[PDB]
């Protein structure tokens, strides 16, 4: 049933819109709604009505038939169903191969190979770029585009590299995914994943590059998350073996470094867990010594936070020799030069040296802060091993990166770590308003299309600027470390000094909860920092008496992840902080991806309770907004979105009309008179024809009719 005039949708203040200036609601209580035949459209573009419940409505009706997938435009959105669903089968895999984009339902599988047809096409590089808050479903699509080139390539100990490939993936989840609050498996890092293909297609090699790791998790706790998951796997004890070489109980509570939130959780199969990361590193070609010396680290890893200290000026010296010695043999190295390195660090005097004196409180720094460099260093050398053995060496031309980041986060004690991640999070935003509202323009200006450039509203530029640019969150912050007489105050008084009321999007904390000292308007929220810690975590200086001795070590890995160390520069008669390298990274990054095509998924997390089918409307419509899902369909609907080359124009239609042909565009003219189209519904370019959305889907069905 439907009434053209009286059905529509209105605000709501509990479910932001709902089904009904003056009407009474379907309910009681006192926008056009789209008809019947645009329900559960695989395109919103397409629907007749565009404003935020049309879209709202379309997504929750697909949500509600299981279709987490739907087109919004150009690019993709997806809704986590917190479900299985028989649609990522090997089966479904198949049939996807070589389809044209509607020529099958919205799915992740179809931009996975519409991206490879683009690639042979074009002949250029493809990047799918997944975006989306904690828990909205980056790293199970970021899987399932792996998943889909494996299985297609596959077609035609260690295993082919299409098995290599996929395993990758598990190997790294276990020693760099969480328990956070918003996630059960939380990346507490960022990976971009190249995937090589030769002139022809064939699937050559891979290669994964990671972006900073969340290292205080190693060391520390929130009360509702858990550290990395591979511990708990570890003390699951499915392999006894491992906690007696390990030298280790099957409690956490027995270990401080581990234990200070959560130990196990509800939807984590602990036990199951350590079987698939320790398959992965057998498919992935690690050797038995390789396997054994990083789990080695990580029990050593547990040990050194249980090492107490006490009083012999303040010296500390050891409170008891127990948990050094089981730490030392595991790393290979004399327990009395460890406590004696951590206790009394040497100081160079040219060629001798002279020992400086630490206190319990710095020792105890000292050993979480070796703890979490052991654990980087051993991530980093993961991933090295993963790329050694998944080059191929065979030829490559192309290549499809696939960019599965740290998602937005806010808990309720925000630090340094949490500003990273969002930072990421708004910049790859950016690129997305950039490429879709910028660039897009542009190219109809660069054609000699008649345009009127739009203002989108899309540019987060003043929140980018006032962390990276010069004078800003991370400026102020380097500057301040190599300041040894500067503290946490004269670092929070240099940013209210620089940027409270001359910054918009730098406001005081919001603030019960813990103690926030400043506030950021970020793309999708208000984030409440606290900078207690900030020069200590940018600077990450580390004992390097320890350092040597773990150079010298009897086991090859501790020694390999310490070889080449950066070893405070010598002295003359008169360095990269962690932020620093992080947007270095991060505008490589950024300016890499600029120079391939880009595809937009766009994830939605439905709800606050991990509840599968549940959709509110609130948080919903908060992403689509800071995404510019809406923005993005616009750009869509009031441009052209599609244009094809004169040459390939008459190569592909001239079927539809050979009497019209000889230039490439005047010939192209011709063509389109001809047919029975509206004539509004394209222009013409310097080298391509510009078409409206969806006139190429109609030449296209005439094109197969004949
Ligand atoms: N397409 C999906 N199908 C089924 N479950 C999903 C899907 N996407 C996400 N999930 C569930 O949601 C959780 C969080 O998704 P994840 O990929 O870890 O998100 P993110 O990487 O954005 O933090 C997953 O561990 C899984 O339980
Ligand atoms: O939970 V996340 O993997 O998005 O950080
Ligand atoms: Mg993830």
Not at 59 to 64: C, V
Not at 394 to 413: C, K, S
Not at 473 to 485: A, Y
Not at 603 to 608: A, F, K, L, Q, T
Request: hydrophobic share 40%; with cysteine; charged share 25%.
């Amino acid at each position: 049933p439907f009434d053209l005039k009286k059905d529509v949708f209105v605000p709501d203040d509990k479910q932001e819109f709902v089904k009904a200036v003056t009407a009474e609601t379907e309910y009681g209580k006192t926008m056009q709604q789209n008809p019947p035949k645009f329900d559960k459209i695989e395109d919103m573009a397409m629907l007749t009505f565009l404003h935020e419940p049309a879209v709202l409505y379309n997504l929750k009706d697909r949500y509600g038939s299981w279709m987490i997938y739907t087109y919004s435009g150009l690019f993709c959105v997806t809704v986590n169903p917190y479900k299985w669903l028989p649609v990522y089968t090997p089966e479904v895999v198949a049939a996807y191969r070589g389809k044209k984009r509607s020529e099958a339902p919205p799915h992740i599988f179809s931009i996975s190979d519409n991206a490879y047809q683009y690639m042979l096409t074009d002949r250029e590089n493809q990047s799918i770029l997944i975006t989306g808050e904690s828990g909205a479903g980056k790293t199970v699509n970021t899987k399932r585009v792996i998943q889909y080139f494996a299985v297609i390539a596959a077609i035609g100990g260690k295993g082919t590299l299409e098995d290599q490939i996929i395993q990758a993936n598990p190997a790294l989840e276990a020693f760099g995914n969480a328990k956070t609050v918003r996630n059960d498996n939380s990346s507490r890092f960022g990976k971009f994943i190249r995937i090589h293909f030769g002139a022809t297609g064939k699937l050559a090699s891979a290669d994964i590059e990671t972006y900073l790791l969340e290292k205080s998790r190693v060391i520390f706790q929130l009360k509702a998350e858990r550290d990395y998951h591979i511990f708990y796997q570890i003390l699951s004890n499915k392999k006894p073996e491992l906690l007696d070489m390990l030298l280790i109980t099957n409690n956490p509570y027995d270990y401080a470094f581990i234990s200070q939130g959560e130990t196990t959780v509800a939807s984590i199969d602990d036990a199951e867990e350590l079987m698939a990361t320790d398959n992965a590193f057998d498919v992935l070609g690690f050797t038995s010594e390789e396997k054994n010396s990083m789990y080695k680290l990580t029990g050593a890893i547990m040990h050194f936070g249980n090492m107490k200290f006490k009083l012999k000026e303040e010296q500390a010296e050891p409170d008891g020799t127990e948990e050094a010695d089981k730490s030392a043999y595991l790393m290979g190295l004399n327990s009395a030069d460890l406590l004696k390195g951590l206790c009394h660090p040497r100081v160079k005097v040219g060629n001798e040296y002279v020992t400086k004196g630490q206190n319990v409180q710095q020792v105890i720094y000292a050993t979480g802060a070796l703890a979490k460099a052991v654990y980087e260093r051993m991530f980093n050398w993961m991933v090295t091993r993963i790329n050694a053995t998944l080059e191929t060496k065979q030829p490559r031309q192309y290549f499809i990166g696939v960019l599965d980041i740290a998602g937005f986060e806010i808990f309720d004690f925000n630090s340094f770590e949490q500003l990273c991640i969002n930072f990421t999070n708004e910049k790859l935003q950016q690129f997305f308003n950039h490429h879709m509202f910028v660039l897009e323009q542009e190219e109809y200006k660069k054609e000699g299309i008649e345009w009127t450039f739009i203002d989108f509203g899309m540019d987060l530029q003043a929140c980018i600027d006032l962390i990276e640019k010069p004078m800003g969150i991370m400026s102020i912050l380097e500057e301040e470390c190599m300041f040894p007489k500067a503290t946490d105050m004269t670092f929070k008084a240099k940013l209210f000094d620089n940027h409270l009321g001359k910054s918009a999007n730098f406001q005081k904390p919001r603030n019960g909860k813990p103690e926030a000292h400043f506030s950021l308007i970020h793309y999708a929220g208000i984030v409440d920092y606290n900078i207690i810690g900030w020069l200590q975590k940018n600077k990450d200086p580390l004992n390097e008496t320890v350092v040597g001795l773990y150079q010298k070590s009897s086991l090859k890995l501790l020694s390999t992840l310490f070889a080449n160390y950066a070893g405070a520069d010598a002295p003359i008669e008169k360095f990269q902080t962690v932020s620093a390298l992080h947007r270095e990274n991060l505008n490589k990054l950024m300016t890499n991806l600029r120079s391939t095509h880009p595809h937009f998924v766009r994830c939605i997390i439905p709800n606050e309770t991990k509840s599968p089918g549940v959709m509110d409307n609130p948080l919903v419509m908060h992403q689509l907004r800071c995404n510019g899902v809406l923005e993005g369909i616009r750009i869509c609907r009031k441009g052209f979105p599609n244009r094809i080359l004169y040459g390939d124009f008459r190569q592909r239609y001239r079927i539809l009309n050979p009497a019209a042909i000889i230039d490439s565009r005047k010939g192209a003219e011709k063509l389109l008179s001809s047919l029975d189209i509206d004539h509004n519904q394209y222009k013409f370019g310097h080298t391509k024809v510009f078409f409206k959305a969806g006139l190429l889907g109609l030449l296209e069905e005439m094109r197969d009719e004949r």
